[PDB]
Amino acid sequence: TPLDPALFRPDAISDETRGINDFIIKAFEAVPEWWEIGAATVREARARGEGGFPLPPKSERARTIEIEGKGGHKVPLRIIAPESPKGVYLHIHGGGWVLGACDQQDPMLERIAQNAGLACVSVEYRLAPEHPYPAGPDDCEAAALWLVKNAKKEFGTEVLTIGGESAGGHLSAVTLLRMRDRHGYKGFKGANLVFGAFDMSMSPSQRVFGNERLVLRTVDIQKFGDAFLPNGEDRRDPDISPLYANLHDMPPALFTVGTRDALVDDTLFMHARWIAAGNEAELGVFPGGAHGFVAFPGEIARAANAQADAFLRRVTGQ
């Protein structure tokens, strides 16, 4: 069982992981906070490669299309695809519903296209605080509906998967439930849910992680959530917190999390409810992993990304 308590004890963490985490904490002791200087200001700087983590290099083979969003705006979709796709991976980026972009993780999309043979489609959904809930989910639902309708003609295949990191793992679960409830679609083959947020009312580990700046502090969660949900929304509503939804008829899922993530309980709890609803689920727990650990160098990141590639192969008939 992936729920081995030894994985959660200090001696399970490698010296490599400890060192990576220490550098990350010390690096961001001065990175200004977006709620102090402005979300758009932080966004523009990050897109230029200023501040924050390194900006991953973009792929030359990426192409962009636009689809119609609810209310008449355009929702861009970024496509990185092999010659003869074996399926599609609908990817939703993270960033607390406030930051990030569809073009800030091309190496990961290239990895999945190469190692699982999938056409990758990453969604440029609207961001808070400018566009709070339900704008983000509305755009991800529009992308999933577009893919259900157009995947065969665009990619030659109707084998679909979904996934994303942190807020993107949240939005992946919200989208799966909306496709089932609003459209009667239950045909996704798998969900790659990478340290997702599933309880917007704050699970136990979120509340006590504290404010040591290992990627995601308790205060970060609070500020992101307030930007996404500024209007007195019920934070246990199932469209806001998928942990509270009825999870019947969901696809097989892979849940990935590190043991030093404020969102550890979100993954463990969502994994439990996914199984309790009769769905297949795989769990990968990585000792010492920070929130966001899959983007860093080192062994636990490599192993977690390899587990994701193997899962995506398995659910797409490979």
Next chain:
Amino acid sequence: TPLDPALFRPDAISDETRGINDFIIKAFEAVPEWWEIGAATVREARARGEGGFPLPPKSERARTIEIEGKGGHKVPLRIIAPESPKGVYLHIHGGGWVLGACDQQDPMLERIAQNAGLACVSVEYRLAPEHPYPAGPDDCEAAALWLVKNAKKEFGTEVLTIGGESAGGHLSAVTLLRMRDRHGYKGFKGANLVFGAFDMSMSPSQRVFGNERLVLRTVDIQKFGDAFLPNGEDRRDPDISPLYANLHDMPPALFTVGTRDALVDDTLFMHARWIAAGNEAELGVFPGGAHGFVAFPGEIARAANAQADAFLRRVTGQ
């Protein structure tokens, strides 16, 4: 692996278990609501085997003592003990903090005394709504302190375990945390947590179970909680909801639950956090089991009780 989705699907439930559950619903439907005829009235009904559960015959070996409680009242303890005990089982009965008694489960105490060789001590704690929080926990804490101090003299051993059902599983966890935090005691060998309640803010499964009267309905959980917590208490406080506490340095635990229990998420979530804190935990999931299923005949009850007996033997060195 106990966390197998197949156990949660309808075809895993045996005909025997389905027939048991049908009778159980009809038996509970014949009982008036305690908030409509009085808690005292239902306590009396429950004591005559007319409150849904069967009448449990009392043991001839049982003896009762009284210890000093916080504030001067007396807390009765019911003792069923073999001649040369291998340890002690501190037992805390269930009943939604409102119902039940120390003398309504003698067959279970006799089973543990005989099969695990433990002296059993069952706590007669004060009940809501007349004595709301923290009266019940205060009495369980007093019992545990008395047992640590007096176990060697009374029973010839200092090997201790703790356990209980439903609200009794809640109180067992509350007691373990108080003993660690206030009293420095980390000596319990094991915790037998039988379908416990651990989140008084109501976990997802509690909210959606509904009001078909398979032992414990959503409405029952709501009414029990309000009687126990009538003074505006924060229901995510860690002394009220152990799911929110820091779980370091806890004993090995056995978590038992049936798949048709409103409290299924409480067990799965508490199990997850128990392991995530670096503690040993064992999980038993029983297909089709109602809340309270161990009290009713049939294979799954026998199997679950056998798993508890084996756990208690293991943690006491046998």
